[PDB]
Ligand binder design. Structure first.
Ligand SMILES: Nc1ncnc2c1ncn2[C@@H]1O[C@H](COP(=O)(O)OP(=O)(O)O)[C@@H](O)[C@H]1O
Ligand SMILES: Nc1ncnc2c1ncn2[C@@H]1O[C@H](COP(=O)(O)OP(=O)(O)O)[C@@H](O)[C@H]1O
Ligand SMILES: [Zn+2]
Ligand SMILES: [Zn+2]
Lengths: 601, 242, 431
């Protein structure tokens, strides 16, 4: 149809004089922002030109891949009157659409619907390539040492020439990749939402193509809304068709999203400092850390120290100190052990939920792995590797063999891995924060024995844990009265977690607050004190490991408060923590240490 | 649109350019809308498109527009869908000698002048290869005096080029080809305009030759060399250490 | 035009200077004594000198590069004869080399724009595939005409043989014994695993190099590189790759036994000031553990140790272990772990491990086979990585018996042997 005359003038009328509220030319903003941005794309809300006139959508629907022809050129028209030499730079424009109401599944597609506007739902998985393919073509001829002019390529074919401008010769032709111009092409997988596959049925799957410089706007595990068109694929080698002569189908999709990049502004950090300096945030930290369970405050506090990370240093590049904090929990499975760590995975920055064998992301090591695509040898590392700045969670630490244990040992020992396999040798940075859990032998903790005697762990990696917290059966009435009430009300002051991760994102950047040697020889004093009081009634010692850790906790709380340097009356908190850490870690014989080592409270 | 403006502004090689890009747009549109018009390589698809768009607006020109098998096919298909000098008495055209002049990448104005010369005075001839040979040679010697003034390696390369473009091992005939046209074309106002433009006057400037010939000794026969010459020759021996 | 640019370039050769000393001029004068036929370059040095080459080498590099090659060869040709006239036929093109530090852009933020331009970046290495060869000059005879000719190729290690010089098509044999070739390899790359999304496997990329830009690198060596996002061959698509034009390695990442052995001269004099002090021993004891307390007697052994001892050989082969063996023994605290953390730092080419072997770490030679051809190769060893070095261990207690045995043999003879099915080994530990 040659009604492109009326159609073009009236759609450009739409494009220009569009007014909806307050006489608002909404798309002038779009185009001027585009030209500001060196942008290649532009969006147009379907609902309003559909409100005005819908046989727009009809002459679209009959052949929408031919409805394009006026609109891309119209973009350049509006562009150059507001941005000369843009057409010089950006050779061509694509467009985007929004707000289309019709819905189909990935299964509901019928022949009556294709070659028309299609709008689906699903999930982007198995992302492959951002490969380049052609849009402009020139050549290297042999019978003459010269070229071809510029040529646009269709949506559905290769190209080949036998004419030449010098003569009608079908000489050997070859493309000049060393001069041609290209664009972005993606092949993408797309699958239905399993939260709604009805009873018994299975979910179908499809394949998707993504163009227009919109590649890598997606990642595995996202809910997506591609609106587009639909068609077959005459990809040659088709006369070998047994059965009936029936063909695949493929989408070309234009619009794309991810619903169904954390950073700090001026006021966002203004308020951070405002609240950090004002009167002891930390009670409200543990009030707002993880309301999954009402639970208990002590281990929340321990892992709050584990959150922020302290400060590492080296004495001129030697005698290193670890700034980042470790933890270790244990106790009967009847209570919530595998909850808040996954919460923390949801709440941190560059956290991970790895695991041992079964329902794991990776095997907690690094290895020369294949890839399903084209046998790409790669070097993945355990989730420890991923958060060399951050943290690595684990559950069921016990359930490990020789080497998967030696690895974590190496990590908390020298903070670096080594590999001696496969024509490749290397070390890395494993300065990660460790968290874990495990299960005691016999459900209950066996209160009447020490730790390594009760649980069958080994010590040398056990020593790295500044904290080793434990609970057991909590047996009184009030335990029931609170926990049953909460767990039923699940189905019958504290600050946003967004603000809290944005605080740590603000914290690991800026503050490296110091400590002033003002009254620190009390360290030397109370250390020597309790290091003797230990032998006074106890079996095992306490060692400088603990002291170093208390200092790391001190700077931890410094980063927490966000103060400029150490405060004295918070070393009380740090040392109290390590004190009542060693309290519960021992026999009933320690019951005298309960009375002795309280003066340091 | 780039390629459209390219092939559309390929015709020269006010309302025209505008109406013709619009024409090709809606033409290509109409041709691709329906499922009726296929197996048409885009290799060639903006040419009788442009010819009929010439046919449409107001004035059309059969020459210099189509400038082949399927040219006719697609036309109907769309239109339904809607030595050299011993050779005696040779013949030539506009574009034959546009080629033999454009081989030096000379402008087209000089070529049009030789064409006018021909089509007025190609009447009483024996062989036009001589006349046009001499013509384009005395275009080259007049416009290319600069590069030759500093590069005497040119005059051998150029004469060798036109010696074998017209397939001879003997050349003194070419010498005659130059001096005879120079005897002939010697005194026309346009030739005059070119000589004031590109300033040969036997290959030498005016403000020099008049003192060469009126009767002077101030006449500068540049046996000596200019100052900038030495100013730049000194750099070659500056680094003589290496 | 192009020769204007050639001169704007060649003036930079001998008319550039900084810190009042010629740089590249005498660099070439040295390189030619080296018989190297290449150089080194910075491109930072060209921006102030001249802006007539930068903005065009950027966007049309391949158009500009072989020009520089030929300019270089031109400079060579004069200076060759001049230096032959000074003291005391075949001078090919010189590979150019360069580098930069302007920026680093990752693989993730690429696109299909700025293709065939030049880009800067980071990553990690894998491949050491094979010395694949290409041609540079190869002679041709026709089989019927016996009509000799010749061909030479330049950069792309565009056209093919001649289709006709009756002899028919394909009339040409390629002669080898008077032909010339060069080497390249196919080199991979992949990003920092620490700067990646939580979820997916990583993306790698190939590249190619040439004569003296070859064999610079061995995997694990983190390196930055600059190159040209070139192309070769779903519906219609070409593979993205890159052409190298600049490599820069950390000087020596993971400790190379083929280390430096010819030290500078300025250091000898302070070395021998320290030879001749009487305080040598006491200084070393004051300084090996400066942030560490007591156990002077323990720190007084390490210096006996690191210097080794009497390599003594006798005409049977029963050497004596030139070095010494040691064992800390004691409790928490008492610095038993911290020195061991330290000693690798002070160490030149030695290694650290935990026990049992560490993650992906054979405490001795854990031999296996090739991913390709399924062949035998001695892979690794924490006891042979450190040949001619110390080894640091913690948690000696939980050995495996098979793991303990060979290490138990090293410390009295320092030579492991493995004689599994087909391979027969005597690999020297000397640690
Ligand atoms: N205090 C609690 N409040 C609510 N739910 C709880 C509580 N304690 C335990 N649970 C539930 O019981 C489970 C305990 O699992 P967990 O002991 O972590 O398993 P494992 O020991 O294998 O890691 C949790 O998934 C949690 O949902
Ligand atoms: N003798 C010592 N003098 C000073 N600081 C020490 C000493 N021994 C250990 N430390 C410190 O105590 C911490 C514990 O390390 P270390 O005692 O070496 O490990 P382990 O207790 O597992 O043997 C380290 O950070 C170290 O700096
Ligand atoms: Zn041809
Ligand atoms: Zn032949």
């Amino acid at each position: 149809p040659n009604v492109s005359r009326t159609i073009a003038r009236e759609l450009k009328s739409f494009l220009l004089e569009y007014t909806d509220e307050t006489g608002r030319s909404v798309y002038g903003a779009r185009i001027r922002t585009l030209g500001e941005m060196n942008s290649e794309s532009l969006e147009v809300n379907y609902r309003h030109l559909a409100e005005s006139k819908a046989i727009l959508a009809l002459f679209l629907a009959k052949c929408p891949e031919e409805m394009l022809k006026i609109f891309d050129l119209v973009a350049m028209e509006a562009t150059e009157l507001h941005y000369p030499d843009y057409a010089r730079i950006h050779s061509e424009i694509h467009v985007r659409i929004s707000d289309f109401p019709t819905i189909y599944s990935l299964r509901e597609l019928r022949e009556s619907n294709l070659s028309s506007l299609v709008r689906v739902t699903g999930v982007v998985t198995r992302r492959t390539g951002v490969f380049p393919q052609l849009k402009y073509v020139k050549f290297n001829c042999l019978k003459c040492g010269s070229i071809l002019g510029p040529f646009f390529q269709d949506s559905n074919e290769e190209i080949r020439i036998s004419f030449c401008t010098n003569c009608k010769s079908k000489g050997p032709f070859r493309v000049n990749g060393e001069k041609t111009v290209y664009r972005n092409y993606q092949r993408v997988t797309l699958q239905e939402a399993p939260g709604t596959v009805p009873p018994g049925r299975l979910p179908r799957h499809r394949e998707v193509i993504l163009l227009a410089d919109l590649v890598d706007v997606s990642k595995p595990g996202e809910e997506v809304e591609v609106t587009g068109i639909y068609k077959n694929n005459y990809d040659g080698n088709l006369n070998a068709k047994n059965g009936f002569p029936v063909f695949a189908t493929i989408i070309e999709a234009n619009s794309i999203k991810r619903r169904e990049v954390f950073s700090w502004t001026e006021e966002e950090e203004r308020e951070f400092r405002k609240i950090s300096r004002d009167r002891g945030i930390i009670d409200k930290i543990i009030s707002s850390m993880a309301p999954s369970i009402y639970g208990h405050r002590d281990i929340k506090t321990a892992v709050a120290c584990s959150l922020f990370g302290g400060v590492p240093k080296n004495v001129n590049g030697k005698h290193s100190i670890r700034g980042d904090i470790n933890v270790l929990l244990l106790g009967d499975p009847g209570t919530a052990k595998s909850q808040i760590l996954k919460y923390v995975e949801k709440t941190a920055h560059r956290a991970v939920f790895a695991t041992g064998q079964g329902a794991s992301a990776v095997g907690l090591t690094a290895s020369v792995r294949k890839d399903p695509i084209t046998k790409e040898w790669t070097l993945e590392g355990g989730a420890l590797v991923l958060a060399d700045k951050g943290v690595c969670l684990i559950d069921e630490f016990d359930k490990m063999n020789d080497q998967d244990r030696t690895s974590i040992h190496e990590a908390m020992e020298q903070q670096s891995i080594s590999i001696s396999k496969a024509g490749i040798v290397t070390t890395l940075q494993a300065r990660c924060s460790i968290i874990a859990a495990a299960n005691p032998n016999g459900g209950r903790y066996n209160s009447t024995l020490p730790l390594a005697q009760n649980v069958s762990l080994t010590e040398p990696i056990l020593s790295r844990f500044d904290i080793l917290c434990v609970v057991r059966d909590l047996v009184d009435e009030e335990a029931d009265e609170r926990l049953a009430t909460f767990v039923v009300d699940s189905h019958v002051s504290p600050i946003p977690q967004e603000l809290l991760m944005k605080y740590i994102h603000y914290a690991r950047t800026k503050i490296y607050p110091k400590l002033h040697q003002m009254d620190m020889d009390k360290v030397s004093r109370v250390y020597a004190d309790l290091r003797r009081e230990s032998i006074s009634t106890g079996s095992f010692p306490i060692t400088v490991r603990h002291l170093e850790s208390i200092l790391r906790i001190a700077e931890s709380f410094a980063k927490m408060r966000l103060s400029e340097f150490v405060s004295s009356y918070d070393l009380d908190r740090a040392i109290k923590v390590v004190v009542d850490s060693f309290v519960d870690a021992q026999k009933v014989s320690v019951r005298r240490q309960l009375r002795r080592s309280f003066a340091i409270y | 649109q780039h390629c459209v403006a390219e092939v559309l502004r390929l015709d020269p090689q006010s309302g025209y350019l505008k109406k013709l890009t619009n024409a090709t747009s809606i033409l290509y549109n109409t041709s691709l809308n329906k499922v009726m018009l296929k197996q048409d390589e885009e290799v060639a698809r903006c040419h009788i498109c442009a010819y009929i768009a010439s046919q449409k607006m107001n004035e059309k020109h059969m020459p210099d527009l189509c400038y082949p098998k399927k040219a006719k096919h697609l036309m109907n298909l769309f239109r339904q869908s809607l030595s050299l000098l011993v050779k005696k008495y040779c013949k030539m055209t506009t574009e034959e000698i546009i080629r033999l002049c454009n081989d030096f990448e000379l402008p087209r104005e000089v070529a049009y002048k030789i064409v006018d010369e021909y089509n007025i005075n190609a009447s009483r001839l024996v062989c036009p290869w001589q006349l046009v040979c001499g013509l384009v040679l005395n275009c080259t010697f007049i416009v290319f005096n600069e590069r030759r003034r500093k590069d005497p390696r040119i005059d051998h390369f150029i004469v060798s080029k036109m010696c074998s473009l017209m397939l001879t091992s003997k050349v003194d005939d070419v010498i005659e080809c130059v001096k005879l046209v120079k005897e002939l074309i010697i005194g026309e106002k346009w030739f005059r305009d070119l000589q004031i433009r590109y300033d040969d006057f036997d290959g030498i400037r005016y403000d020099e030759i008049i003192f060469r010939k009126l009767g002077s000794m101030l006449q500068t026969t540049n046996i000596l060399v200019t100052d900038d010459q030495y100013n730049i020759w000194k750099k070659r021996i500056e680094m003589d250490l290496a | 035009d192009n020769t204007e640019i050639i001169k704007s370039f060649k003036n930079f050769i001998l008319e550039f200077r900084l810190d009042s000393q010629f740089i590249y001029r005498d660099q070439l004068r040295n390189n030619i004594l080296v018989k190297n036929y290449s150089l080194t370059v910075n491109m930072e040095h060209l921006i102030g000198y001249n802006e007539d080459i930068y903005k065009k080498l950027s966007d049309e590099p391949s158009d500009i590069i072989p020009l520089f090659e030929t300019a270089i060869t031109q400079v060579a040709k004069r200076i060759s004869i001049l230096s032959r006239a000074q003291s005391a036929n075949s001078l090919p093109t010189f590979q150019l080399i360069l580098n930069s530090n302007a920026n680093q852009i990752p693989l993730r933020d690429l696109d299909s724009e700025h293709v065939s331009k030049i880009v800067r970046l980071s990553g990690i290495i894998i491949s050491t595939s094979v010395l694949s060869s290409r041609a540079t000059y190869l002679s041709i005879m026709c089989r019927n005409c016996r009509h000799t000719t010749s061909i030479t190729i330049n950069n792309f290690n565009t056209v093919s043989l001649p289709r006709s010089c009756n002899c028919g098509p394909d009339p040409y044999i390629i002669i080898h014994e008077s032909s010339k070739f060069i080497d390249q390899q196919f080199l991979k790359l992949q990003e920092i695993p620490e700067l990646v999304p939580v979820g997916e496997m990583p993306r790698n990329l190939t590249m190619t190099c040439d004569r003296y830009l070859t064999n610079k690198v061995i995997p694990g060596t983190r390196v930055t590189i600059v190159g040209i996002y070139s192309i070769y061959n779903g519906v219609a698509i070409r593979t993205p790759y890159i052409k190298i034009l600049g490599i820069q390695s950390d000087v020596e990442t993971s400790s190379i036994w083929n280390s430096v052995t010819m030290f500078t001269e300025e250091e000898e004099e302070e070395f021998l000031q320290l030879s001749r002090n009487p305080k040598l021993y006491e200084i070393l004891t004051n300084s090996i553990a400066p942030s560490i307390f007591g156990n002077e007697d323990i720190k007084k052994a390490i210096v006996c140790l690191l210097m080794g001892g009497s390599k003594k050989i006798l005409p049977d082969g029963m050497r004596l272990r030139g070095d010494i063996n040691v064992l800390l023994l004691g409790d928490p605290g008492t610095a038993k772990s911290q020195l061991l953390k330290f000693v690798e730092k002070v160490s030149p080419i030695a290694v650290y491990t935990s026990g049992k072997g560490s993650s992906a770490a054979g405490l001795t030679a854990s031999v296996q086979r090739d991913p390709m051809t399924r062949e035998f190769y001695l892979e690794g060893g924490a006891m042979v990585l450190a040949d001619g070095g110390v080894v640091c261990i913690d948690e000696f207690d939980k050995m495996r018996d098979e793991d303990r045995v060979a290490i138990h043999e090293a410390m009295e003879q320092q030579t492991i042997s493995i004689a599994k099915a087909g391979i027969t080994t005597v690999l020297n530990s000397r640690t």
